[PDB]
Design a binder for this molecule. Structure first.
Ligand code: MG
Ligand code: MG
Ligand code: MG
Ligand code: MG
Ligand code: MG
Ligand code: MG
Ligand code: MG
Ligand code: MG
Ligand code: MG
Ligand code: MG
Ligand code: MG
Ligand code: MG
Ligand code: MG
Ligand code: MG
Ligand code: MG
Ligand code: MG
Lengths: 82, 123, 205, 129, 80, 150
RNA sequence: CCCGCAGAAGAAGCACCGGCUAACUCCGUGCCAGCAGCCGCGGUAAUACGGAGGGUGCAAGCGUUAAUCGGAAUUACUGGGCGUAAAGCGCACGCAGGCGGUUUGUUAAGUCAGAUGUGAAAUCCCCGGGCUCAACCUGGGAACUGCAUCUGAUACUGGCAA
RNA sequence: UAGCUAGUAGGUGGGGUAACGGCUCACCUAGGCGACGAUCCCUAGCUGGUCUGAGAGGAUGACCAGCCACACUGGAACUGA
């Protein structure tokens, strides 16, 4: 089944995840269906750090995708509306 | 000339015959000293140039130059050779890495020691 | 990485003061400058276009105490950036911290000014920056760390700093030993005796 | 052989011109004309003239400004051996802009300034300057 | 029609084993001159009806044989 | 704005009963920096004698060139003997990039921002020259309308 | 990452200097020993061998070899040549092939226009953002010069007609 | 290397596969390919892209990603979505 998860395109000791929709069987940083956000866990308090096109994530889940454990947290950490 | 012509038979780029079959593009090759000659150079020059015919790891037998002043290399010595002709000695197209394998470095050299393979003398 | 060698020798070969003993005395002499950079310096270097073209960039280089690799990369950056390649090059060369430290008087010569940088005796917008090539941008604010303030060097430093024509693109205290890179120096600031277009040519072919 | 008249035009001109020849004539055709047009309308010749009926005869009046000829260079570009076609964005400009390039389009034989403004492109018959 | 092809017959002499030539001009990718690059296609035509020399209109179907993926649609002209 | 430079200086031999008698040649360029350039040759049994004798020849034998700002209007081709040259306006990046030899004529002649290149034989006497003629033939970015207009 | 501690304390090498090519002298040697990317250096004053002093270039690298493209317009499509330098078949006829005068009609394949879809992300490039700088990381554009479908335009080319 | 081809090319029916299909069979037709380079021989995983070049090009296919293919060699199928 398709899933939404974090690819780790970071850089030794300073990760920076892409969040993607893809065939759950493929490699973490492998073939994917569409990108749907990102997640800098070293965002720093300055500005940005977890942009996340919700209305797509919505589409796929609607089409049966599962979500990660971490991503799930990000969606319920983005709050959702504000 | 003609467009048609080029169409039928495209322009072809001549391929590059190497000047040093150190086989397969290799930085250098190991080999064993078949003979340790010393012959004399071509037209203008006149000398007793040291060389050595060398059976290479890859089968090629090749005559290689021995750079420097004085060397201890005899039959059966195992050496390393690199690209580098010697115009004077037609036929010679490779040099021998002084201070490699059984090849000694040049005795006493002070200038340009890394060529000729000489340790930084205990200053 | 740092030149490190007898430094007047340089100016002598370049034929001009590169301000590397900068400190006290001026208009050299008490040195020998000019007529014998070596054992054949007495001789006239009737020299190629390549030679003149070489020594110019060499001069500029010996000046900011930059080695070839970095200098090349300056040049490349310059060229990338729109504007007169040669001017941009000069710009970049000034944006160097170490330079904008000697240039605010905090250091006798750029060499000294740099020792300060590497010895964590400077702070941009508050924070310590100890890397000589830290590029400094408009409105920046380079101060001396409280720790070791008005200590030896930095005094006389800020002193004859005023003997010098004295900048314009940067306003600078002297009590606090802070100061503000106000704007990127224009062509017309600095120069006269330096010929970009040559050292653009050297690196063109 | 006759095979490429349009070059023959371009040439009978180029030549006569270099021969400070007043006029110059040749077998005519729908096509020769449309170009003789652009050539006049862009002021590289005085005026043309087609005098016949069964065996038409294009005739061009040449120009000379200073002492020179006005047409400083006239070359084919497309040709039977090798046709050239350019899209609008890929149309060529002669002498940076001075002088012109004759291009035939689905809306007739016009200059490059022209076809460019017309937003289209076609076969680039010849260059002139 | 989701596209169609024209092309001249070339070979009619076989129980529905019709083969049609298709002729395009194409800019030489290297020397700019335009040349004729032909295509042959094995096309089905139930109850054999076209004839050598016929121009014909053609459409791409599924496999009617290791060779055939095209049935004909219409005929155009004859007795060349 | 005197502005002059020599491009090449060369030795040549004559050969007589008593041996080779040698001599030098000079190839120069002079321009005002605002159009107008000329080259001179002039040879002489010694070097300064030759370069001088050249600079002079170059003072006359000077043509002028319809610039357009610090650059050229349209791209131009030039060609004399074995030398065949080509140069282009170049909406000045910085500009002035060419084979020191026609950079010379370019530089002095006042063009400020071209890119140029020499094909065929790099023989100076014939490139600096294919380049002069090259600029010469180049026509006025408006006296093309003079040409036409009518 | 931050603070204290000691003492310049533990930290400079490699190639080159006849021309091309930035950098010159002495001593040894004497067509020897040897150098050499190319030219070419060595037989008594060698800036070219080897050593030294001096210098030039690069720097935790520096040289040598190997390897691709560049300069090479030296396979020339852009962009070349064949009287005498490499190059016109000893001559002709001619199949395929290429090319083909001039007019009108028609066709719309070539050609041209527009629209739509597609051209994975990364990479490259532009403007930013984050690691003391940088390399590195990252936002967003731009670009992917292509391909296909549809509809159009008919001057040129191709087809059909006369 | 100038000719190649008998399941060969097509048809009809039976069988077969998850599926169209000479996939297979039987029978019939005599076709199918080919100088716009088949056949034969030599070499080779393809691409995104990578280096170089002003471009056009040239050269290349490590590291990252996409596709294919292989799992001591040859041949087989079983289980199973
Ligand atoms: Mg370094
Ligand atoms: Mg020199
Ligand atoms: Mg040496
Ligand atoms: Mg001596
Ligand atoms: Mg080339
Ligand atoms: Mg040639
Ligand atoms: Mg001949
Ligand atoms: Mg003949
Ligand atoms: Mg016609
Ligand atoms: Mg992409
Ligand atoms: Mg930053
Ligand atoms: Mg027609
Ligand atoms: Mg069946
Ligand atoms: Mg090129
Ligand atoms: Mg197996
Ligand atoms: Mg099963």
């Amino acid at each position: 089944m398709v899933t939404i998860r974090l690819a780790r395109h970071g850089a030794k000791k300073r990760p920076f995840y892409q969040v993607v929709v893809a065939d759950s069987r493929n490699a973490r940083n492998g073939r994917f269906i569409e990108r749907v956000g990102f997640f800098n866990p070293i965002a720093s308090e300055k500005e940005e750090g977890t942009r996340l096109d919700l209305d797509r994530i919505a589409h796929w889940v609607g089409q049966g995708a599962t979500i990660s454990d971490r991503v799930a947290a990000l969606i319920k950490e983005v709050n959702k509306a504000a | 000339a003609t467009v048609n012509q080029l169409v039928r038979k495209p322009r072809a780029r001549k391929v590059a015959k190497s000047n040093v079959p150190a086989l397969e593009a290799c930085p250098q090759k190991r080999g064993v000293c078949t003979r340790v000659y010393t012959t004399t150079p071509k037209k203008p020059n006149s000398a007793l140039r040291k060389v050595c015919r060398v059976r290479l790891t890859n089968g090629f037998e090749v005559t290689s130059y021995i750079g420097g002043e004085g060397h201890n290399l005899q039959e059966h010595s195992v050496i390393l050779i690199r690209g580098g002709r010697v115009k004077d000695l037609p036929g010679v197209r490779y040099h021998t890495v002084r201070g490699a394998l059984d090849c000694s470095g040049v005795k006493d050299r002070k200038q340009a020691r890394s060529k000729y393979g000489v340790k930084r003398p205990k200053a | 990485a740092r030149y490190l060698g007898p430094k007047l020798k340089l100016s002598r070969r370049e034929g001009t003061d590169l301000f590397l003993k900068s400190g006290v005395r001026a208009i050299d002499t008490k040195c020998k400058i000019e007529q014998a950079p070596g054992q054949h310096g007495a001789r006239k270097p009737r020299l190629s276009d390549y030679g003149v073209q070489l020594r110019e960039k060499q001069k500029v280089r010996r000046i900011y105490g930059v080695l070839e690799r970095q200098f090349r990369n300056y040049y490349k950056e310059a060229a990338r950036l729109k504007g007169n390649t040669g001017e941009n090059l000069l710009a970049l060369l000034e944006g160097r911290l170490d330079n904008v430290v000697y240039r605010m008087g905090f250091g006798a010569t750029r060499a000294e000014a740099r020792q300060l940088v590497s010895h964590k005796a400077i702070m941009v917008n508050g924070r310590v920056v100890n890397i000589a090539s830290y590029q400094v941008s408009p409105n920046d604010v380079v101060s001396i760390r409280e720790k070791a303030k008005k200590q030896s060097r930095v005094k006389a430093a800020l002193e004859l700093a005023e003997q010098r024509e004295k900048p314009t693109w940067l306003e600078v205290d002297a009590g606090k030993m802070e100061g503000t890179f106000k704007r990127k120096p224009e062509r017309s600031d600095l120069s006269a005796d330096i010929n970009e277009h040559l050292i653009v040519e050297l690196y063109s072919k | 052989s006759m095979q490429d008249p349009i070059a023959d035009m371009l040439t009978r001109i180029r030549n006569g011109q270099a021969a400070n020849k007043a006029a110059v004539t040749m077998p005519s055709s729908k096509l020769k004309v449309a170009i003789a047009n652009v050539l006049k309308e862009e002021g590289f010749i005085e005026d043309f003239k087609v005098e016949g009926d069964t065996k038409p005869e294009l005739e061009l009046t040449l120009k000379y400004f200073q002492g020179k000829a006005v047409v400083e260079s006239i070359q084919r570009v497309s040709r039977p051996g090798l046709r050239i076609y350019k899209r609008k964005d890929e149309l060529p400009k002669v002498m940076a802009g001075l002088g012109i390039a004759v291009v035939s389009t689905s809306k007739g034989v016009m200059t490059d300034r022209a076809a460019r403004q017309a937003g289209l492109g076609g076969e680039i018959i010849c260059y002139v300057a | 029609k989701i596209r169609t092809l024209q092309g001249r017959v070339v070979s009619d002499k076989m129980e529905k084993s019709i083969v049609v030539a298709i002729e395009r001009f194409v800019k030489h990718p290297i020397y700019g001159k335009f040349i004729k690059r032909t295509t042959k296609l094995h096309v089905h035509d139930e109850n054999n009806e076209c004839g050598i020399g016929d121009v014909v209109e053609i459409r791409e179907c599924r496999p009617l044989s290791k060779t055939k993926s095209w049935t004909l649609v219409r005929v155009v002209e004859k007795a060349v | 704005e005197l502005q002059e430079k020599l491009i090449a200086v060369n030795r040549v031999s004559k050969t007589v009963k008593g041996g080779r008698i040698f001599s030098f040649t000079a190839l120069t360029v002079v321009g005002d920096g605002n159009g107008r350039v000329g080259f001179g040759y002039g040879k002489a049994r010694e070097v300064p004698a030759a370069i001088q004798k050249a600079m002079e020849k170059a003072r006359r034998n000077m043509i002028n060139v319809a610039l357009n700002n610090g650059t050229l209007q349209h791209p131009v081709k030039g060609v004399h003997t074995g030398s065949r040259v080509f140069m282009q306006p170049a909406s000045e990046g910085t500009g002035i990039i060419a084979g020191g030899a026609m950079r010379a004529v370019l530089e002095v002649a006042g063009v400020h921002n071209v890119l140029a290149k020499a094909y065929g034989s790099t023989n100076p006497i014939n490139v600096v020259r294919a380049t002069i003629d090259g600029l010469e033939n180049m026509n006025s970015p408006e006296m093309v309308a003079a040409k036409r207009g009518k």
